[PDB]
Design a protein around this ligand. Structure first.
Ligand SMILES: *Cc1c(COP(=O)(O)O)cnc(C)c1O
Ligand SMILES: *Cc1c(COP(=O)(O)O)cnc(C)c1O
Ligand SMILES: *Cc1c(COP(=O)(O)O)cnc(C)c1O
Ligand SMILES: *Cc1c(COP(=O)(O)O)cnc(C)c1O
Ligand SMILES: [Br-]
Ligand SMILES: [Br-]
Ligand SMILES: [Br-]
Ligand SMILES: [Br-]
Ligand SMILES: [Br-]
Ligand SMILES: [Br-]
Ligand SMILES: [Br-]
Ligand SMILES: [Br-]
Ligand SMILES: [Br-]
Ligand SMILES: [Br-]
Ligand SMILES: [Br-]
Ligand SMILES: [Br-]
Ligand SMILES: [Br-]
Ligand SMILES: [Br-]
Ligand SMILES: [Br-]
Ligand SMILES: [Br-]
Lengths: 450, 450, 451, 450
């Protein structure tokens, strides 16, 4: 009989009075029975509060805010499968438009074909691996032609992001990473060349180093490679990892030569969901021409009576991000992006200037558009001790919900501890002022409590 | 004067009356100026109508519908980055619960420290490549131990999905694919063994073949491999590609032994956004134990005063799907999933029965839960000419917005043309009846027009 | 133990997991029990996907898009009964303001009572029948005065829309329809006169012919009728069927004299839900003065102390459309409408120009504001053969969701097959370009597959 | 120089601080310029408040409330054109399902080919005119056959609704309306017959008289017509005007024989937007068989290879209501409707009982389901005077927003003043109690102020 009583409650009982919400959520085995949808939702929604406030997350590089239209486009495309080119043809079409534009944006040679050579991706990581395989294949072919061994390929680069380490491991490539050293936290021409040989599949400059936020200018490295060929006959290509810079420089530092204007640059990759203003789940990779992308890596698909080529490690995935990306392009344009990016740099500059007045800080990065991304990276002046450590400050800030990372650099600077503040879209001046206030407040506390 | 008149219009002009919407959308170069967001949105929204109705797309296997709560959870997590374990800790937590849960659904051995060994992925593709590298590495190690060459690895499998071909290409592995042949459109024990040798990294059965919708039972293949070892001493492992079956059999055919109940199965993968009921952008891969996943492939990350391992090709990406998947698990449970899956099978069976009464057909798949996924896959009886070809029929149906594919099988059955109807969640009986009606209607037309 | 088991499911089951959605929808008898509202809704919502995409329906003349405000106004007025003038007084009031504004747009003589004479309708059809009865009654009275028989009334017109045929049938009037003939797909002065007599209740020019999209200019027909009276003493009135043109010309071709500027025009009708930008369910009909509308057809109703006359076939009905129409008027005004209408003509012109370069077509309408509505109408150049009929092409386009009709004209042109593309609000340039693309694509396929 | 200001203002000004809202709305000529959409909306929205509260409108018979789903279905179908059968096929399909269902509800002979004869309409009015022409045509044909004059047709009826008067006028038919008289406010058998002749096209009983809310039982009238034919050989048909009753009796008084169970009833009409629970803009008319509907009144249109007849005065119009009506049918069914209608009757009965205790009243309708619609209709007992008139009361109640009509009956009862309260869906008991309270309060005031 109670089954009826209990059943009436499953019905009328409120949400927090419901019996279904009186136990802890399952975490070990697949649940047995179904439950009130509202309770299940409520439970998960509430658990998520423990993630903290994304808008206050100053560690991430990825977008933490989206405009109303992107939200709608995403919900509208929650089921559009980016991979089924023939089934969702217009989405496929839009994707191609974006490839042209990004390629265009990066000064790629006008596609005489009428359609730039590139592809969308879940993020820069996939993009990089695509670019990676591209290089390994191009290299492999070249060596086989000159009848040389192709079993000891290596990749030369500076302080790259973890995904390159992953590439090297998964595709068995020796990663020759020029280490960071006091005074030079990046790959310089000299040390680069000293690492190149006939087995080098390419060099990967990082146009926007994660750890520091500074650009790794390709120009000088490009020259060095030109000379290197003149001296050894070894022709080395470049792949720019512009996850960050890719959607920054083009708008606020158009004179920095880092893209396809450089001959050795055969491919560029960037994260659309970082400064590209697209929602998480979007990356881009562009090749300078059909000759830069080995046909053996491309798998053709049926697209509108013809055949379009694909090259992606993933398969089925939402098309929402690409659609949104295209939206931001049409809605903002160069003008728009510039204004938005400036806003970020403006804030980064401000914080850098202000924070400098509150302690013995040596700034590694101060949001100068001609030097890198809208970031503020710094460490304690060597030797000097203010009473705290950057780790300490960080913690204090976390008490107000802020996530401002404090970490050690790598290579030959493992004893240098820096703090890095990222100024993404949606971290307006007024909001950043609050950060500053809590920063001053934190110092005061650390002072009164040695 | 003019600029002000123009501007006042840019301000009061209605959406369609405005000047910004009087030109074709940009598709070749990055836009120069910003424009009214409502126009930009409208343009894109409308272009998307050319994608067709996803609910009527009977070709895809991925979810084309999501409940109200998933929509909310997705919008709420539009900016949660699944990769930043330390920054969005609870999302990370929830993900782990999921793995546990999936591993449980597949009989994985009682996990160690309360946490099964697995990872979430963008889709089955990434999952499979993860499982792939796992095998190659396990094999490589083994061979090096016995001091044998590891430069000629091959993978044995039946009619796999394109991602495996991609795996083989990207990771340089010989793909030995047992071809489909009339009467046997899958990998049989005999032909499998004839393809295995000491260089075989593993066998990949496809628990839910795409082309036909039928299961490729691992049991028989497993026995064959047991014997094979007894005769050659060669121990071969399996990796089940359960993109489809993975979230079907467990609920409607629990007695089919295909998972971890089989000793040789070291890893299983499945598409969460297919029959897992998760929105696009979610896949799963589980390993039998810590010994099946080579530590060299794992990159530890900081997480809750300790180190957690991560294995993925991607990096930054939305955590929405994993959060949603967890939701569907708690809200539905075995009971729920069963009910939902049954609904699908019920429809597939209905269509298969009805369609049979309208033409000279030989069914390859008829929505039998004990044979495979909820799909209807048939062909014209060898030697019959009803007046039309399945291609013709597909096109007549598209006239009503339906997408019912007609294609040729591969291997030794390249001259066999089949039609395949997928019955996903959200293709209820009443809705399928309408397909049937249009089906009958199409036949009538094709009849009246020889 | 089973009813509770099954009940708990009714409660907890998923939408599609639910048992209620495991059967086909009822279609023969009134359902017996109630069911989960969400399921019932889901079922219907999904069936509707089979209607196709309205935005891609290039056959219809009626609005296929509405702004956010109209949507709200409609939702807000889902229960306001347009007929209960005394119960929903302000709606009634707003309605009247519209009649005044339409009458003003059409130059109707300025009313001295302050309120023009006209009424709102569900659509042009009802409007036309109201205008029809008006004429029959005016005629009937006139004849009875001159002591003549009133049992053989006829109506003269060109290629009218089906509703007129319906009028003729329902109200027993002989319909003398001047047939379309190659080179002249409309009613010309000469053939018109040859059909008029003392039994003719009136002539109905169609200011925006459906089949071709061209205007049927009243000016010349008006003159002809003036002469006709001078020679026979027979005074014939006109009723313009401006379902389309009514809300087009006034903004993009103000010089075309077709409205009340013409003396014989006693009444005009137009579809508000067509180019009037109102949501489906709105039409208008205006009379030039209180003398053009026979009081015997009017039913006065109590309205705020005084009296107000009601002339309409339908009784109860949504006031939403009227309210929305008024909104569009205030929000857009002449300026607004003009910009919107231009956008349409602009697209129609573009398509017409581009499609012409793809084959041996002879155009019947190129979207010129001075000739007709925003539409592109055409046929295959007489005696030509590119390897396909316009019907085939139509089909090829349906495969992309487009609905572009291909049909045969009537009268003496029954062997001429045309295709007609309608460019309504919400068929922006970028969107139309996609149509063009698919059009080129269709031709290519038809080419590679002669069979 | 001032313009640029007016513009900047028209851009930032709030809705009410804007200049566009400082003038009275245009009401004489078509506006010249466009204006801020928000202002235009606001203006109209606010004017509409002067309409009063529809939920409190107890004079109307039409729905004044709709469930959330109907609202969505209506918004979803704001652009579906009910007339374009070929262009919006499924809506057309749904429509037909309703026709069968209503026919089934009224006991029409089970259709011959799975489809009953009838059509949807904007409201009962159009439905009645369709039924009217039907009769005139049937009659006309009959007479022509027997070679008799067809220029003096008349229609016999009781206290019909205004639309019939309109029918008579527009289609030139003599309306013989048996007048209401004290003690008999409806058409009785005897006076009906005394009005019938060979020129009578039919008799129209009103199954739910507006003025009083009581049913006009067809049974007795039907018998009288049977006899009439036996004595004169004149066969007269009936057309029931069940605008109200049509969707009431079937559920709460199934034993009242008034529909197609009666042989002479060749057509029935009813307002779906009244007690059919459909939103305004929906009516129905059903014919007993293909022989009752003159093919000359039908016009055919191409629909799915075939064709279907369309009898309808209107043309283009929304399909939302029909779609909603179908929804209410499936969601409620007999069970549902019965529960909803009972709720209304229950309220009507309650008010009738309570109001009777407040003054010297004589009731004409007390919400009995076996006598008529859920309404309360009373007058002051003859020659009795409480100190007011039903007009005063009506007015006093209006002061609280209530619209409770007080009017005089017609015919030979023009000196009888009645008050009529309509109890539609959405006038629940608790709500009605408030009316009662204000009713008592009104009486008290009228008492203290002679
Ligand atoms: C952030 C970043 C990546 C990773 O890109 P995702 O979008 O996370 O896939 C790779 N390289 C660099 C230099 C980065 O900053
Ligand atoms: C659909 C499918 C895949 C690809 O799944 P994704 O989610 O797109 O990665 C892989 N394998 C099989 C057997 C499949 O059916
Ligand atoms: C569309 C049209 C009609 C029909 O009027 P509705 O508003 O659709 O009821 C009548 N006449 C003409 C000339 C039309 O174009
Ligand atoms: C309300 C009513 C009508 C009017 O029909 P509408 O649905 O209002 O168009 C006609 N007859 C009767 C008996 C009515 O009650
Ligand atoms: Br609560
Ligand atoms: Br609650
Ligand atoms: Br956001
Ligand atoms: Br340093
Ligand atoms: Br507009
Ligand atoms: Br707008
Ligand atoms: Br959805
Ligand atoms: Br076969
Ligand atoms: Br579900
Ligand atoms: Br649900
Ligand atoms: Br819309
Ligand atoms: Br012609
Ligand atoms: Br304000
Ligand atoms: Br405001
Ligand atoms: Br409501
Ligand atoms: Br009485």
């Amino acid at each position: 009989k109670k089954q009826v009583t209990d059943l009436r409650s499953e019905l009328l009982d409120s949400r927090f009075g419901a019996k279904s919400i009186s136990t802890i959520a399952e975490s070990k085995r697949f649940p047995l029975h179904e439950m009130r949808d509202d309770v299940a939702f409520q439970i998960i929604n509430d658990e998520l509060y423990l993630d903290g406030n994304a808008r206050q997350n100053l560690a991430t590089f990825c977008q933490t805010w989206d405009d109303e239209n992107v939200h709608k486009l995403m919900d509208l495309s929650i089921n559009k499968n980016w991979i089924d080119k023939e089934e969702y043809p217009q989405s496929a079409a839009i994707d191609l438009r974006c490839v042209n534009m990004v390629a265009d944006l990066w000064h790629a040679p006008a596609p005489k074909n009428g359609q730039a050579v590139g592809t969308n991706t879940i993020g820069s990581s996939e993009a990089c691996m695509l670019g990676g395989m591209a290089m390994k294949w191009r290299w492999r072919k070249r060596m086989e032609a000159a009848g040389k061994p192709t079993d000891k390929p290596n990749l030369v680069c500076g302080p790259v992001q973890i995904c390159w380490h992953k590439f090297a491991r998964y595709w068995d490539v020796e990663l020759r990473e020029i280490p960071m050293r006091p005074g030079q936290l990046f790959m310089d021409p000299k040390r680069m060349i000293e690492a190149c040989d006939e087995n080098t599949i390419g060099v990967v400059p990082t146009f926007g180093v994660t750890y520091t936020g500074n650009y790794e200018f390709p120009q000088p490295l490009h020259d060095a490679l030109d000379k290197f060929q003149a001296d050894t006959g070894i022709d080395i290509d470049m792949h720019i990892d512009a996850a960050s810079g890719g959607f920054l420089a083009p708008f606020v530092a158009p004179d920095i030569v880092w893209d396809f204007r450089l001959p050795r640059v055969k491919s560029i990759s960037a994260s659309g969901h970082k400064f590209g203003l697209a929602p998480l789940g979007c990356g881009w990779v562009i090749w300078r021409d059909e000759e830069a992308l080995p046909q053996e890596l491309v798998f053709n698909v049926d697209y509108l009576g013809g055949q379009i080529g694909t090259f992606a490690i993933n398969f089925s995935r939402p098309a929402g991000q690409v659609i949104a990306q295209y939206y931001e392009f049409l809605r903002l344009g160069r003008e728009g992006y510039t204004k938005v990016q400036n806003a970020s740099y403006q804030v980064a500059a401000y914080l850098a200037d202000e924070i400098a007045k509150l302690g013995p800080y040596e700034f590694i990065c101060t949001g100068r558009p001609d030097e890198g991304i809208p970031a503020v990276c710094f460490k304690l002046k060597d030797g000097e001790d203010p009473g705290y450590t950057l780790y300490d400050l960080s913690e204090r800030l976390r008490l107000r919900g802020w996530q401002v990372p404090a970490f050690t650099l790598g290579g030959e600077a493992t004893d240098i501890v820096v703090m890095r503040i990222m100024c993404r879209r949606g971290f307006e001046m007024d909001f950043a002022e609050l950060l500053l206030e809590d920063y001053k407040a934190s110092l005061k506390y650390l002072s009164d409590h040695p």
